Amino acid sequence: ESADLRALAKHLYDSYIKSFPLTKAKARAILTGKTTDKSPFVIYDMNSLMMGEDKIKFKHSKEVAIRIFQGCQFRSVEAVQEITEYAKSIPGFVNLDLNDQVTLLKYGVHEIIYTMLASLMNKDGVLISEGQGFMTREFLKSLRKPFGDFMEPKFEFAVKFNALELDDSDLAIFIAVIILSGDRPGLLNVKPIEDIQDNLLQALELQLKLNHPESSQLFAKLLQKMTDLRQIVTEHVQLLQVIKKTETDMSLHPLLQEIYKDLY
Numbered sequence: 001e002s003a004d005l006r007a008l009a010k011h012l013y014d015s016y017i018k019s020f021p022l023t024k025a026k027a028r029a030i031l032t033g034k035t036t037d038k039s040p041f042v043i044y045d046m047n048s049l050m051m052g053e054d055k056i057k058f059k060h061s062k063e064v065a066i067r068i069f070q071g072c073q074f075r076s077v078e079a080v081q082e083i084t085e086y087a088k089s090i091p092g093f094v095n096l097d098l099n100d101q102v103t104l105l106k107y108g109v110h111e112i113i114y115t116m117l118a119s120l121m122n123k124d125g126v127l128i129s130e131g132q133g134f135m136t137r138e139f140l141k142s143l144r145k146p147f148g149d150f151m152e153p154k155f156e157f158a159v160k161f162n163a164l165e166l167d168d169s170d171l172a173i174f175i176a177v178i179i180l181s182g183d184r185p186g187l188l189n190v191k192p193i194e195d196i197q198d199n200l201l202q203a204l205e206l207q208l209k210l211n212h213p214e215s216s217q218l219f220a221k222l223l224q225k226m227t228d229l230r231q232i233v234t235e236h237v238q239l240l241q242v243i244k245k246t247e248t249d250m251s252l253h254p255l256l257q258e259i260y261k262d263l264y
């Protein structure tokens with residue numbers, strides 16, 4: 001059966017590479033100093049942010065904190081698209097009842113977004129604009145309340161998560177585990193979801209033993225990270241509700257509204 005779990009690890013890694021254009025491997029090459037990739041422009045104060053608008057080519061007049069809020073929406077919407085495409089490659093996912101597919105995505109996308117965003121972070125800041133830019137943790141922390149408090153729990157989680165030193169092939173199986181959670185609210189057929197996740201769990205466990213043979217209990221350490229993930233979602237939802245009440249000239253992207261509607 002080991003050969004089957006290895007073929008599943010290989011399948012998920014291959015689909016991960018095809019679904020996510022900016023991998024952890026490329027993110028680390030950018031952050032460290034490697035010559036396979038090029039150096040980002042660093043935004044650290046109000047001054048350099050304006051220089052960065054003219055220096056960084058962005059994919060997508062208001063206040064600075066508002067402009068960053070809107071920027072993260074566009075990337076997050078893109079992330080949902082990438083995650084959805086990846087979910088369809090997880091064997092058995094598309095054969096599930098359609099309402100459960102929707103439900104698994106609705107509750108899984110943000111847990112995956114924060115997981116993969118850790119690949120883009122270090123203790124000092126986060127890559128932006130497919131890695132062309134780098135915004136510092138202290139600069140985001142200084143933005144006017146309550147916008148300045150949006151990213152800090154993500155950084156704190158990323159520092160703990162990155163200490164596990166997972167690579168993309170590990171992360172491919174782990175985010176599949178996250179998607180296939182039989183405990184999501186409103187699921188209709190829990191059993192076929194759990195059966196798929198049990199297989200994904202055995203594949204993840206084997207991958208972690210083979211890939212990190214001197215990292216004891218990495219499987220257990222990784223699984224316990226779900227506590228931090230859900231706390232982030234919880235806090236993030238709370239801050240979004242403050243923004244909704246204080247900025248009535250803004251709305252979340254419709255795709256994100258649907259994800260957050262009746263969540264928990």
Ligand SMILES: CSc1ccc(/C=C2/C(C)=C(CC(=O)O)c3cc(F)ccc32)cc1
Binds near residue numbers: 065069114117148256
């Ligand atoms: C002023 S510093 C800041 C403040 C607010 C935001 C707002 C954010 C918004 C709307 C989203 C969209 C979603 O929740 O899906 C998001 C996703 C993330 F990973 C991280 C941050 C944010 C981003 C940065």
Ligand SMILES: CSc1ccc(/C=C2\C(C)=C(CC(=O)O)c3cc(F)ccc32)cc1
Binds near residue numbers: 067072127128
């Ligand atoms: C041209 S005025 C501007 C406005 C906002 C930004 C800031 C951000 C943008 C575009 C993004 C999207 C991405 O990463 O591609 C982002 C993601 C994050 F976690 C944190 C901050 C930012 C840069 C420039």
